[PDB]
């Protein structure tokens, strides 16, 4: 029912988003992590195996934490 992969991660968001983008090799080294500020926006259509963390000059990473 769920792309075999990274159900969920902790608390990235907020916390750099090269941390987070190590957590998501660390954790799903499968998948491949990427990063960038808020732009491509993503819905439904999503990389199961993929973890992007996005950014927002607000001065804070935003790494959905959930994939697909």
Known sequence: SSCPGKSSWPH????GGSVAKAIIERQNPNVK???????????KD????????????????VSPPRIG
């Open 12 to 15: 990235l968001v907020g916390v």
């Open 33 to 43: 992590a990427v990063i960038l500020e808020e732009g491509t926006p993503v819905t």
């Open 46 to 61: 999503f990389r199961c195996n993929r973890v992007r963390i996005w950014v927002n000059k607000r001065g804070l990473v």
